[PDB]
Design a protein around this ligand. Structure first.
Ligand code: HPK
Length: 283
């Protein structure tokens, strides 16, 4: 599987044409699963999941979607609360692709979008796997904005290589993962005009008139499906205390925490994460 072989585009309607880029794999597998990546600078489906995608595609029909504002999806300068906006785009994609009820795997901002989708279009979301998710998290102990969120904001204001590297270093427990090559690669993607534009629009959308749509910890008691929360013990973006309200109030919740793991569980605990996900989604 390559970036190019799996690449797909769809045009959906969200207050007008919206181009969504995604990656498709495991065609011919019975159960479809949608992956939604995080909202870091230069983040996209392939960057976030390329290696997980190969493994999951052995078991599932994988659709890894670049959320609007990211990757090769449209990067509008304006939109409503981000997760509701992205969930509307996803609903458009489901309808176009003829998807019924499908499980979703989402990390961070993508976890928030998965949850917003499951709440807004309840018939359409199956089991959820959420890694250090935004939206349904509320940091009962950590002062907000957290270290991770601050570093993202600082880059968005001052898009320097140094600031990007600073952000990446708080995504992981093992900082040796933040190589010069990774930094250089992510910076090239994160510092384009369209990307900076998008990032800004995203952060600010959480404080718009529909900000309550982002406060999903107030609503997830309504979720009827099993939900597997997965957290790195050392997550410095959406820290572990953020898991508690969701764990308490989602009737069929489970939580798995990995020690010696940061925000990027799908990278730092690759094997364990893939196995949990495969088992939970029933493969
Ligand atoms: O994509 C990555 O590099 C990553 O997982 C970063 C996630 C941060 C994120 O989703 C976020 C978005 C908005 C506000 C705070 C946090």
């Amino acid at each position: 599987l390559t970036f190019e072989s799996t690449s797909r585009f769809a045009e959906v309607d969200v207050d007008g044409p919206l181009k969504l880029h995604y990656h498709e794999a495991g065609v011919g597998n019975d159960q479809t699963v949608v992956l939604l990546h995080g909202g870091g600078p230069g983040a996209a489906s392939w960057t976030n999941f390329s290696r997980n995608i190969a493994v999951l595609a052995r078991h599932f029909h994988v659709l890894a979607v670049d959320q609007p504002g990211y990757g090769h999806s449209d990067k509008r300068a304006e939109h409503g609360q981000f997760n509701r906006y992205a969930a509307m785009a996803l609903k458009g994609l489901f309808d176009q692709l003829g998807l019924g009820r499908v499980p979703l795997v989402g990390n961070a901002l993508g976890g928030g979008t998965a949850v917003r989708f499951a709440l807004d279009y309840p018939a359409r979301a199956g089991r959820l796997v959420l890694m250090g998710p935004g939206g349904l998290s509320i940091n009962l102990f950590a002062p907000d904005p957290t270290e991770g969120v601050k570093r993202l904001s600082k880059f968005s204001v001052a898009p320097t290589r140094e600031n990007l590297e600073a952000f990446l270093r708080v995504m992981v427990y093992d900082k040796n993962l933040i190589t010069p090559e990774l930094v250089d690669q992510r910076f090239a993607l994160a510092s384009t005009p369209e990307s900076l534009t998008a990032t800004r629009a995203m952060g600010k959308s959480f404080a718009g008139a529909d900000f309550e749509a982002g406060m999903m910890w107030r609503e997830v008691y309504r979720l009827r499906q099993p939900v597997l929360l997965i957290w790195g013990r050392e997550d410095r973006v959406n820290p572990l205390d953020g898991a508690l309200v969701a764990l308490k109030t989602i009737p069929r919740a489970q939580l798995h925490v990995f020690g010696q793991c940061g925000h990027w569980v799908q990278v730092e605990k690759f094997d364990e994460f893939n196995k949990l996900t495969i088992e939970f989604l029933g493969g």
